[PDB]
């Protein structure tokens, strides 16, 4: 087990001594302002190792951070004891340390004229047992995730918390999915109902989990605390309606107006990628279904090649517009800026993942006769490329309903197998291609790209869409994903350790933009599943009422289930909110105790009716010192006897 | 202006001296436990006037109540000053006084073997200017509503707060409703779109208002504070997860199972009243459209009579099942119990308000040929009643599309005119029928029924449904309601003063069950409006895709609008939440100030790098007292020069 003695590493690129010298000078000038530097130069770049020296001054600032999170209400309970050191009964976590030091570096104390990067070093002692403990376990448990938060941060931890919860919830659709395949058969208007029910439950259950996880880890509402973006544009300056501190304001409704440009942008993405995919599918159909002579196996790869080149090209242009629109929307914090860029990308992600299936489930199988003009276009086009005047050999276009079965097999099996290779082996091959001791490790680590949690998130989010929308045509899909995900926990944990550098500890109280992404796929999957069932069942397909009634019920079945699930979950206890409420209440009570001396809420008693009587006297006396208004038959019994006399009096009349 | 000197009045029924005497004795025995009694007997019943004597002991308990609402988090800020009397800078409000005294009476200190009632007396001085100030104003303002809360309570105030907000929001559909009638015409697939958009906006905006209103009046979350029901059934006893006090527990999921019986109950209500209304409508059609000889004007009233007798009879039985089911569901607090009974009643309310229109807009006009079997039933039935063997004269059933126009005129104009008479004149006639001074006023007041806010709520809630659902066939409906509501504010205020006794001051943070009622009518009104437009437009009516596509778009238009409106309103500032957050933060900060002496959050400075250096020494010294691990080139410049030497060193290789 190799050890480390450094907190952070900062490499400064060396181009020309004029600017590179200036870079090294003032960078050093600033770091020593609060932190120690040892600078050994390797791999053509000087490496500025930075760690916190004084632990007394550091524990003084970590404690100040604990207080800060409390003051804005992120942290439920004040660190009231005021003993900075004995408050390490809740010790400084490695993630908490690395984050706060990274703050000191990357607060307004730096960012510095093209510094290559800033990153902490891994812990091989920890990384070894990590992949070991998880490869021995069949089932992970919350303590493991808490450990992940401790070394890496909540941003990384939440993914594994999500992946884990999604894995176990993925057991259920694997059950009645296998059951639907075994008994009910394909295109079941029953598996579809169970699918929507499940998607609602898992999602609504996960949202409840994020709250509890935020409370346990103490990051609830951390989204509205992080440093604002440098390139955030502000018109004027006012006071924070909560803190009272000077905050820079930008009209929220003016941002809303700019965000309306996502509607034509999304349409631009659906058209661009959509046309690209529907075209390559038309080639796929023409060369396979419509023969076209020898070399078919060679030609079979041709439409696939168009996808490989076209997808990054077409979407690459669209992303430039996405990145451009993103800045225009002008987000205050870095958290919101990247979360919105992901939402913009999701439209591209949706197209490049499902449009092949939409083409099959709504155009190919249920109709297909509308593909004839597309086929003829390739007929004449193939004739020109042939150079020979003779027509290419042709056979009748025959609709194959097994197309939806083969494509689904790829997405659930083959594409997941080439995934394991691309996500792990290809970066591992890259390392093999590259092929004191600390410094050598430092250089090798310095290469590796920063771990992007977004990449791992969509892989599972897009996969969920396959279940929610198109698994009704392949009910064994949940089973394939369930197996992959068990490996996915291990595999993703493995690539963080060796295929990527240690990411900066970063905090969030949710999976973020992926929530709405999941919510959309689940809803669309209620329409998608039922419509597919009706159309791909294969009586004449009366699109008029037949398709629409099927969608009407299943979509409304989804909506009713949603209200039902939320209602039930709303009457269940939530530890995260309850943990908050109990602490807040005791804090409220203790203050009450202190001021009013442990008399916190007796009854006066009847004997004190004498003091009531004496007080009633005093009003009379003051009034006397000063007509029907002040009439009183004082005394307890005196009023009783009068009424009693009235009792027999009133019966006398009768 | 007649004055009053009493806080509360308690009449004890006088049947037989044996029990009535016992009633008067111990009731007096208990009241004097904390409150004064003067007992004058009138109208065959003894009247026990009750008011608080000691103002020092009363201000001691009002202050204890201010603290209680704080402790559970209802009240944002502690009454920290601890001066009970100088905290009357926020004075005891008449509603606050009357409520707290009513608590002392009606806490576990009473309820008492058939006491007739418990109620405060009106304030004629206040009631006079009330109806005066509002009958002079064209526009009410928030200060007026605040005054209503002060004298009557939040329960009463919220209605007028809702009615006022609903009145001004009702201006908008009156505008493009008049515009649709003036220009676009009936059954406009554009007014319908504007209708759904408005319903979403008004509703979502009002929900935002309730939060701010709750904060302003300091009743936010008061629903979970009020006394539990006596007949609440509990299995075991545990600790409150917040307070830690012994609370009685009843399994929430067991209540959910019982609440599932609302589904067959609702169906039972729709069938019972529905069959009753669809039948009376069949008579209405037969005697008018299908002639049936002389006496038609006399016979015309006959189907109306069936409604008058049948509705309270049929729904009266259904309510017995509702009241029965309500108790089975076993609600902890009185607040939740009555709110669920209202929800059950709403199904009956919906039927008795719209089924006549549904019959017209979906059965009569667009089809009508399915009414022939219903007509023949009345044909033979009328023949038997005639006693003469000769057939009743008959003419061809002709569908009249003006039916939907006449019914809508009634609901918007005529029914609102007979409303003013029924809601105000009829109780006033009752008073005229009935036809010291305080005591006489007391007796007369003692008769009057307690004001029920529920009655006034549904009148506006059911009215809203006419707009959301059926106003597309009569776009001038919003105009009729707009006028009525201006009067409704005045009229309802007038009947509270003279037609009903003063209600017990009661607190709530929302309109309650009516929220979901409004939410349902708005959604169903998106389906209802569009379906009516397509069906009642009058090409052949292709129900298959024509009806369903129309519903698909308009419902999804509603759903998209909802997400749009919520999104926009979520990025708007909310005073009620912000008022809460700012106070909480300052409270948080001040405690911080006190313990750590106004050092609440500087930078160390470079010169202190000397203390950094000395601390770095000490670790070395301890290590010395105890291989590559501890290597340091200490000093700021020493590290700079080494790296600098490396700079020219690395270029030498190149
Ligand atoms: Ca993978
Ligand atoms: Ca992954
Ligand atoms: Ca009225
Ligand atoms: Ca009313």
PDB file of N, CA and C in Angstrom, chain A residues 91-169:
ATOM      1  N   UNK A  91     -15.857  14.229  13.907  1.00  0.00           N
ATOM      2  CA  UNK A  91     -14.518  14.496  13.368  1.00  0.00           C
ATOM      3  C   UNK A  91     -14.530  15.154  11.993  1.00  0.00           C
ATOM      4  N   UNK A  92     -13.425  15.802  11.639  1.00  0.00           N
ATOM      5  CA  UNK A  92     -13.258  16.338  10.296  1.00  0.00           C
ATOM      6  C   UNK A  92     -13.128  15.204   9.297  1.00  0.00           C
ATOM      7  N   UNK A  93     -14.065  15.149   8.360  1.00  0.00           N
ATOM      8  CA  UNK A  93     -14.083  14.097   7.361  1.00  0.00           C
ATOM      9  C   UNK A  93     -13.118  14.450   6.231  1.00  0.00           C
ATOM     10  N   UNK A  94     -12.490  13.435   5.638  1.00  0.00           N
ATOM     11  CA  UNK A  94     -11.533  13.646   4.553  1.00  0.00           C
ATOM     12  C   UNK A  94     -12.154  14.447   3.412  1.00  0.00           C
ATOM     13  N   UNK A  95     -13.426  14.182   3.128  1.00  0.00           N
ATOM     14  CA  UNK A  95     -14.155  14.953   2.130  1.00  0.00           C
ATOM     15  C   UNK A  95     -14.348  16.387   2.609  1.00  0.00           C
ATOM     16  N   UNK A  96     -14.679  16.539   3.888  1.00  0.00           N
ATOM     17  CA  UNK A  96     -14.881  17.856   4.481  1.00  0.00           C
ATOM     18  C   UNK A  96     -13.583  18.658   4.490  1.00  0.00           C
ATOM     19  N   UNK A  97     -12.477  17.993   4.816  1.00  0.00           N
ATOM     20  CA  UNK A  97     -11.166  18.634   4.796  1.00  0.00           C
ATOM     21  C   UNK A  97     -10.785  19.060   3.381  1.00  0.00           C
ATOM     22  N   UNK A  98     -10.722  18.092   2.469  1.00  0.00           N
ATOM     23  CA  UNK A  98     -10.322  18.343   1.084  1.00  0.00           C
ATOM     24  C   UNK A  98     -11.168  19.422   0.412  1.00  0.00           C
ATOM     25  N   UNK A  99     -12.459  19.446   0.726  1.00  0.00           N
ATOM     26  CA  UNK A  99     -13.361  20.447   0.166  1.00  0.00           C
ATOM     27  C   UNK A  99     -13.007  21.846   0.659  1.00  0.00           C
ATOM     28  N   UNK A 100     -12.912  21.997   1.977  1.00  0.00           N
ATOM     29  CA  UNK A 100     -12.645  23.295   2.586  1.00  0.00           C
ATOM     30  C   UNK A 100     -11.299  23.866   2.160  1.00  0.00           C
ATOM     31  N   UNK A 101     -10.313  22.993   1.979  1.00  0.00           N
ATOM     32  CA  UNK A 101      -9.001  23.431   1.521  1.00  0.00           C
ATOM     33  C   UNK A 101      -9.076  23.827   0.055  1.00  0.00           C
ATOM     34  N   UNK A 102      -9.862  23.080  -0.715  1.00  0.00           N
ATOM     35  CA  UNK A 102     -10.076  23.403  -2.119  1.00  0.00           C
ATOM     36  C   UNK A 102     -10.787  24.740  -2.240  1.00  0.00           C
ATOM     37  N   UNK A 103     -11.662  25.029  -1.283  1.00  0.00           N
ATOM     38  CA  UNK A 103     -12.316  26.326  -1.236  1.00  0.00           C
ATOM     39  C   UNK A 103     -11.269  27.417  -1.071  1.00  0.00           C
ATOM     40  N   UNK A 104     -10.405  27.267  -0.069  1.00  0.00           N
ATOM     41  CA  UNK A 104      -9.371  28.262   0.217  1.00  0.00           C
ATOM     42  C   UNK A 104      -8.517  28.528  -1.014  1.00  0.00           C
ATOM     43  N   UNK A 105      -8.192  27.463  -1.739  1.00  0.00           N
ATOM     44  CA  UNK A 105      -7.482  27.598  -3.001  1.00  0.00           C
ATOM     45  C   UNK A 105      -8.346  28.297  -4.048  1.00  0.00           C
ATOM     46  N   UNK A 106      -9.563  27.800  -4.256  1.00  0.00           N
ATOM     47  CA  UNK A 106     -10.375  28.238  -5.393  1.00  0.00           C
ATOM     48  C   UNK A 106     -11.461  29.269  -5.066  1.00  0.00           C
ATOM     49  N   UNK A 107     -11.435  29.825  -3.859  1.00  0.00           N
ATOM     50  CA  UNK A 107     -12.290  30.966  -3.527  1.00  0.00           C
ATOM     51  C   UNK A 107     -11.726  32.207  -4.227  1.00  0.00           C
ATOM     52  N   UNK A 108     -12.229  33.417  -3.908  1.00  0.00           N
ATOM     53  CA  UNK A 108     -11.490  34.549  -4.484  1.00  0.00           C
ATOM     54  C   UNK A 108     -10.061  34.692  -3.950  1.00  0.00           C
ATOM     55  N   UNK A 109      -9.264  33.640  -4.126  1.00  0.00           N
ATOM     56  CA  UNK A 109      -7.851  33.634  -3.780  1.00  0.00           C
ATOM     57  C   UNK A 109      -7.075  33.104  -4.980  1.00  0.00           C
ATOM     58  N   UNK A 110      -7.806  32.837  -6.062  1.00  0.00           N
ATOM     59  CA  UNK A 110      -7.278  32.196  -7.266  1.00  0.00           C
ATOM     60  C   UNK A 110      -8.415  32.034  -8.271  1.00  0.00           C
ATOM     61  N   UNK A 111      -8.061  31.780  -9.530  1.00  0.00           N
ATOM     62  CA  UNK A 111      -9.020  31.660 -10.629  1.00  0.00           C
ATOM     63  C   UNK A 111     -10.102  32.738 -10.606  1.00  0.00           C
ATOM     64  N   UNK A 112      -5.979  30.744 -12.543  1.00  0.00           N
ATOM     65  CA  UNK A 112      -4.928  31.756 -12.530  1.00  0.00           C
ATOM     66  C   UNK A 112      -4.106  31.724 -13.814  1.00  0.00           C
ATOM     67  N   UNK A 113      -4.685  32.255 -14.889  1.00  0.00           N
ATOM     68  CA  UNK A 113      -4.018  32.349 -16.187  1.00  0.00           C
ATOM     69  C   UNK A 113      -3.546  30.988 -16.690  1.00  0.00           C
ATOM     70  N   UNK A 114      -4.518  30.135 -17.005  1.00  0.00           N
ATOM     71  CA  UNK A 114      -4.282  28.797 -17.546  1.00  0.00           C
ATOM     72  C   UNK A 114      -3.430  27.917 -16.636  1.00  0.00           C
ATOM     73  N   UNK A 115      -3.918  27.689 -15.423  1.00  0.00           N
ATOM     74  CA  UNK A 115      -3.411  26.607 -14.593  1.00  0.00           C
ATOM     75  C   UNK A 115      -4.013  25.304 -15.107  1.00  0.00           C
ATOM     76  N   UNK A 116      -3.182  24.275 -15.258  1.00  0.00           N
ATOM     77  CA  UNK A 116      -3.606  23.038 -15.909  1.00  0.00           C
ATOM     78  C   UNK A 116      -4.794  22.387 -15.204  1.00  0.00           C
ATOM     79  N   UNK A 117      -4.707  22.265 -13.881  1.00  0.00           N
ATOM     80  CA  UNK A 117      -5.780  21.675 -13.082  1.00  0.00           C
ATOM     81  C   UNK A 117      -5.506  21.790 -11.586  1.00  0.00           C
ATOM     82  N   UNK A 118      -6.502  21.430 -10.782  1.00  0.00           N
ATOM     83  CA  UNK A 118      -6.350  21.339  -9.333  1.00  0.00           C
ATOM     84  C   UNK A 118      -7.078  20.097  -8.835  1.00  0.00           C
ATOM     85  N   UNK A 119      -6.354  19.186  -8.193  1.00  0.00           N
ATOM     86  CA  UNK A 119      -6.947  17.919  -7.780  1.00  0.00           C
ATOM     87  C   UNK A 119      -6.181  17.249  -6.642  1.00  0.00           C
ATOM     88  N   UNK A 120      -6.904  16.533  -5.764  1.00  0.00           N
ATOM     89  CA  UNK A 120      -6.300  15.723  -4.701  1.00  0.00           C
ATOM     90  C   UNK A 120      -5.812  14.373  -5.223  1.00  0.00           C
ATOM     91  N   UNK A 121      -4.964  13.698  -4.454  1.00  0.00           N
ATOM     92  CA  UNK A 121      -4.463  12.382  -4.842  1.00  0.00           C
ATOM     93  C   UNK A 121      -5.321  11.264  -4.258  1.00  0.00           C
ATOM     94  N   UNK A 122      -5.361  10.129  -4.951  1.00  0.00           N
ATOM     95  CA  UNK A 122      -6.122   8.972  -4.490  1.00  0.00           C
ATOM     96  C   UNK A 122      -5.555   8.371  -3.209  1.00  0.00           C
ATOM     97  N   UNK A 123      -6.271   7.394  -2.665  1.00  0.00           N
ATOM     98  CA  UNK A 123      -5.801   6.636  -1.513  1.00  0.00           C
ATOM     99  C   UNK A 123      -5.824   5.148  -1.839  1.00  0.00           C
ATOM    100  N   UNK A 124      -4.695   4.637  -2.320  1.00  0.00           N
ATOM    101  CA  UNK A 124      -4.595   3.248  -2.763  1.00  0.00           C
ATOM    102  C   UNK A 124      -4.920   2.253  -1.656  1.00  0.00           C
ATOM    103  N   UNK A 125      -4.650   2.640  -0.415  1.00  0.00           N
ATOM    104  CA  UNK A 125      -4.995   1.813   0.733  1.00  0.00           C
ATOM    105  C   UNK A 125      -6.509   1.660   0.835  1.00  0.00           C
ATOM    106  N   UNK A 126      -7.223   2.742   0.544  1.00  0.00           N
ATOM    107  CA  UNK A 126      -8.681   2.741   0.591  1.00  0.00           C
ATOM    108  C   UNK A 126      -9.283   2.130  -0.671  1.00  0.00           C
ATOM    109  N   UNK A 127      -8.709   2.468  -1.822  1.00  0.00           N
ATOM    110  CA  UNK A 127      -9.217   1.994  -3.106  1.00  0.00           C
ATOM    111  C   UNK A 127      -9.126   0.477  -3.270  1.00  0.00           C
ATOM    112  N   UNK A 128      -8.130  -0.132  -2.633  1.00  0.00           N
ATOM    113  CA  UNK A 128      -7.948  -1.579  -2.701  1.00  0.00           C
ATOM    114  C   UNK A 128      -9.088  -2.321  -2.011  1.00  0.00           C
ATOM    115  N   UNK A 129      -9.320  -1.993  -0.744  1.00  0.00           N
ATOM    116  CA  UNK A 129     -10.384  -2.627   0.027  1.00  0.00           C
ATOM    117  C   UNK A 129     -11.761  -2.267  -0.521  1.00  0.00           C
ATOM    118  N   UNK A 130     -11.847  -1.125  -1.196  1.00  0.00           N
ATOM    119  CA  UNK A 130     -13.099  -0.670  -1.792  1.00  0.00           C
ATOM    120  C   UNK A 130     -13.625  -1.676  -2.813  1.00  0.00           C
ATOM    121  N   UNK A 131     -12.824  -1.949  -3.837  1.00  0.00           N
ATOM    122  CA  UNK A 131     -13.211  -2.896  -4.876  1.00  0.00           C
ATOM    123  C   UNK A 131     -13.203  -4.331  -4.357  1.00  0.00           C
ATOM    124  N   UNK A 132     -12.474  -4.568  -3.270  1.00  0.00           N
ATOM    125  CA  UNK A 132     -12.423  -5.890  -2.654  1.00  0.00           C
ATOM    126  C   UNK A 132     -13.694  -6.185  -1.863  1.00  0.00           C
ATOM    127  N   UNK A 133     -14.060  -5.260  -0.981  1.00  0.00           N
ATOM    128  CA  UNK A 133     -15.236  -5.418  -0.130  1.00  0.00           C
ATOM    129  C   UNK A 133     -16.520  -5.514  -0.949  1.00  0.00           C
ATOM    130  N   UNK A 134     -16.548  -4.830  -2.087  1.00  0.00           N
ATOM    131  CA  UNK A 134     -17.748  -4.792  -2.916  1.00  0.00           C
ATOM    132  C   UNK A 134     -17.828  -5.983  -3.870  1.00  0.00           C
ATOM    133  N   UNK A 135     -16.678  -6.557  -4.213  1.00  0.00           N
ATOM    134  CA  UNK A 135     -16.647  -7.716  -5.099  1.00  0.00           C
ATOM    135  C   UNK A 135     -16.871  -9.013  -4.329  1.00  0.00           C
ATOM    136  N   UNK A 136     -16.861  -8.922  -3.004  1.00  0.00           N
ATOM    137  CA  UNK A 136     -17.133 -10.076  -2.154  1.00  0.00           C
ATOM    138  C   UNK A 136     -18.594 -10.084  -1.716  1.00  0.00           C
ATOM    139  N   UNK A 137     -19.146  -8.891  -1.519  1.00  0.00           N
ATOM    140  CA  UNK A 137     -20.547  -8.736  -1.139  1.00  0.00           C
ATOM    141  C   UNK A 137     -21.504  -9.032  -2.289  1.00  0.00           C
ATOM    142  N   UNK A 138     -22.649  -9.621  -1.957  1.00  0.00           N
ATOM    143  CA  UNK A 138     -23.748  -9.740  -2.906  1.00  0.00           C
ATOM    144  C   UNK A 138     -24.596  -8.481  -2.825  1.00  0.00           C
ATOM    145  N   UNK A 139     -24.661  -7.919  -1.622  1.00  0.00           N
ATOM    146  CA  UNK A 139     -25.528  -6.786  -1.333  1.00  0.00           C
ATOM    147  C   UNK A 139     -24.785  -5.679  -0.588  1.00  0.00           C
ATOM    148  N   UNK A 140     -24.777  -4.482  -1.167  1.00  0.00           N
ATOM    149  CA  UNK A 140     -24.194  -3.311  -0.521  1.00  0.00           C
ATOM    150  C   UNK A 140     -25.154  -2.762   0.531  1.00  0.00           C
ATOM    151  N   UNK A 141     -24.626  -2.029   1.503  1.00  0.00           N
ATOM    152  CA  UNK A 141     -25.462  -1.470   2.559  1.00  0.00           C
ATOM    153  C   UNK A 141     -25.016  -0.029   2.830  1.00  0.00           C
ATOM    154  N   UNK A 142     -25.869   0.747   3.497  1.00  0.00           N
ATOM    155  CA  UNK A 142     -25.749   2.203   3.550  1.00  0.00           C
ATOM    156  C   UNK A 142     -24.414   2.679   4.122  1.00  0.00           C
ATOM    157  N   UNK A 143     -23.810   1.856   4.975  1.00  0.00           N
ATOM    158  CA  UNK A 143     -22.531   2.186   5.596  1.00  0.00           C
ATOM    159  C   UNK A 143     -21.436   2.350   4.545  1.00  0.00           C
ATOM    160  N   UNK A 144     -21.508   1.543   3.489  1.00  0.00           N
ATOM    161  CA  UNK A 144     -20.556   1.635   2.386  1.00  0.00           C
ATOM    162  C   UNK A 144     -20.664   2.978   1.671  1.00  0.00           C
ATOM    163  N   UNK A 145     -21.895   3.396   1.387  1.00  0.00           N
ATOM    164  CA  UNK A 145     -22.142   4.674   0.725  1.00  0.00           C
ATOM    165  C   UNK A 145     -21.660   5.842   1.582  1.00  0.00           C
ATOM    166  N   UNK A 146     -21.888   5.743   2.889  1.00  0.00           N
ATOM    167  CA  UNK A 146     -21.424   6.756   3.830  1.00  0.00           C
ATOM    168  C   UNK A 146     -19.905   6.872   3.782  1.00  0.00           C
ATOM    169  N   UNK A 147     -19.236   5.732   3.640  1.00  0.00           N
ATOM    170  CA  UNK A 147     -17.788   5.703   3.476  1.00  0.00           C
ATOM    171  C   UNK A 147     -17.359   6.382   2.180  1.00  0.00           C
ATOM    172  N   UNK A 148     -18.157   6.208   1.130  1.00  0.00           N
ATOM    173  CA  UNK A 148     -17.871   6.824  -0.160  1.00  0.00           C
ATOM    174  C   UNK A 148     -17.980   8.341  -0.064  1.00  0.00           C
ATOM    175  N   UNK A 149     -18.989   8.809   0.664  1.00  0.00           N
ATOM    176  CA  UNK A 149     -19.157  10.236   0.910  1.00  0.00           C
ATOM    177  C   UNK A 149     -17.958  10.785   1.666  1.00  0.00           C
ATOM    178  N   UNK A 150     -17.464   9.991   2.608  1.00  0.00           N
ATOM    179  CA  UNK A 150     -16.377  10.405   3.481  1.00  0.00           C
ATOM    180  C   UNK A 150     -15.070  10.679   2.741  1.00  0.00           C
ATOM    181  N   UNK A 151     -14.794   9.898   1.702  1.00  0.00           N
ATOM    182  CA  UNK A 151     -13.526  10.011   0.988  1.00  0.00           C
ATOM    183  C   UNK A 151     -13.628  10.823  -0.300  1.00  0.00           C
ATOM    184  N   UNK A 152     -14.831  10.919  -0.857  1.00  0.00           N
ATOM    185  CA  UNK A 152     -14.991  11.495  -2.188  1.00  0.00           C
ATOM    186  C   UNK A 152     -15.965  12.671  -2.237  1.00  0.00           C
ATOM    187  N   UNK A 153     -17.035  12.607  -1.452  1.00  0.00           N
ATOM    188  CA  UNK A 153     -18.017  13.677  -1.435  1.00  0.00           C
ATOM    189  C   UNK A 153     -19.426  13.225  -1.770  1.00  0.00           C
ATOM    190  N   UNK A 154     -20.401  14.069  -1.444  1.00  0.00           N
ATOM    191  CA  UNK A 154     -21.812  13.732  -1.610  1.00  0.00           C
ATOM    192  C   UNK A 154     -22.225  13.601  -3.076  1.00  0.00           C
ATOM    193  N   UNK A 155     -21.593  14.386  -3.943  1.00  0.00           N
ATOM    194  CA  UNK A 155     -21.878  14.341  -5.375  1.00  0.00           C
ATOM    195  C   UNK A 155     -21.627  12.948  -5.938  1.00  0.00           C
ATOM    196  N   UNK A 156     -20.506  12.356  -5.543  1.00  0.00           N
ATOM    197  CA  UNK A 156     -20.162  11.005  -5.962  1.00  0.00           C
ATOM    198  C   UNK A 156     -21.014   9.973  -5.230  1.00  0.00           C
ATOM    199  N   UNK A 157     -21.244  10.213  -3.943  1.00  0.00           N
ATOM    200  CA  UNK A 157     -21.964   9.269  -3.094  1.00  0.00           C
ATOM    201  C   UNK A 157     -23.416   9.086  -3.527  1.00  0.00           C
ATOM    202  N   UNK A 158     -24.058  10.181  -3.924  1.00  0.00           N
ATOM    203  CA  UNK A 158     -25.468  10.143  -4.303  1.00  0.00           C
ATOM    204  C   UNK A 158     -25.724   9.250  -5.514  1.00  0.00           C
ATOM    205  N   UNK A 159     -24.775   9.210  -6.445  1.00  0.00           N
ATOM    206  CA  UNK A 159     -24.894   8.327  -7.602  1.00  0.00           C
ATOM    207  C   UNK A 159     -24.967   6.869  -7.171  1.00  0.00           C
ATOM    208  N   UNK A 160     -24.026   6.462  -6.324  1.00  0.00           N
ATOM    209  CA  UNK A 160     -23.983   5.089  -5.833  1.00  0.00           C
ATOM    210  C   UNK A 160     -25.177   4.802  -4.938  1.00  0.00           C
ATOM    211  N   UNK A 161     -25.665   5.834  -4.259  1.00  0.00           N
ATOM    212  CA  UNK A 161     -26.882   5.716  -3.467  1.00  0.00           C
ATOM    213  C   UNK A 161     -28.080   5.535  -4.391  1.00  0.00           C
ATOM    214  N   UNK A 162     -28.042   6.226  -5.526  1.00  0.00           N
ATOM    215  CA  UNK A 162     -29.095   6.132  -6.531  1.00  0.00           C
ATOM    216  C   UNK A 162     -29.017   4.807  -7.276  1.00  0.00           C
ATOM    217  N   UNK A 163     -27.818   4.471  -7.742  1.00  0.00           N
ATOM    218  CA  UNK A 163     -27.577   3.226  -8.464  1.00  0.00           C
ATOM    219  C   UNK A 163     -27.965   2.006  -7.630  1.00  0.00           C
ATOM    220  N   UNK A 164     -27.670   2.062  -6.334  1.00  0.00           N
ATOM    221  CA  UNK A 164     -28.019   0.983  -5.415  1.00  0.00           C
ATOM    222  C   UNK A 164     -29.530   0.837  -5.253  1.00  0.00           C
ATOM    223  N   UNK A 165     -30.209   1.955  -5.017  1.00  0.00           N
ATOM    224  CA  UNK A 165     -31.656   1.950  -4.832  1.00  0.00           C
ATOM    225  C   UNK A 165     -32.376   1.545  -6.115  1.00  0.00           C
ATOM    226  N   UNK A 166     -31.840   1.986  -7.249  1.00  0.00           N
ATOM    227  CA  UNK A 166     -32.414   1.660  -8.549  1.00  0.00           C
ATOM    228  C   UNK A 166     -32.199   0.188  -8.878  1.00  0.00           C
ATOM    229  N   UNK A 167     -31.111  -0.374  -8.365  1.00  0.00           N
ATOM    230  CA  UNK A 167     -30.794  -1.781  -8.578  1.00  0.00           C
ATOM    231  C   UNK A 167     -31.809  -2.698  -7.902  1.00  0.00           C
ATOM    232  N   UNK A 168     -32.148  -2.383  -6.658  1.00  0.00           N
ATOM    233  CA  UNK A 168     -33.035  -3.230  -5.871  1.00  0.00           C
ATOM    234  C   UNK A 168     -34.487  -3.058  -6.289  1.00  0.00           C
ATOM    235  N   UNK A 169     -34.829  -1.856  -6.736  1.00  0.00           N
ATOM    236  CA  UNK A 169     -36.157  -1.599  -7.272  1.00  0.00           C
ATOM    237  C   UNK A 169     -36.297  -2.233  -8.648  1.00  0.00           C
TER     238      UNK A 169
END
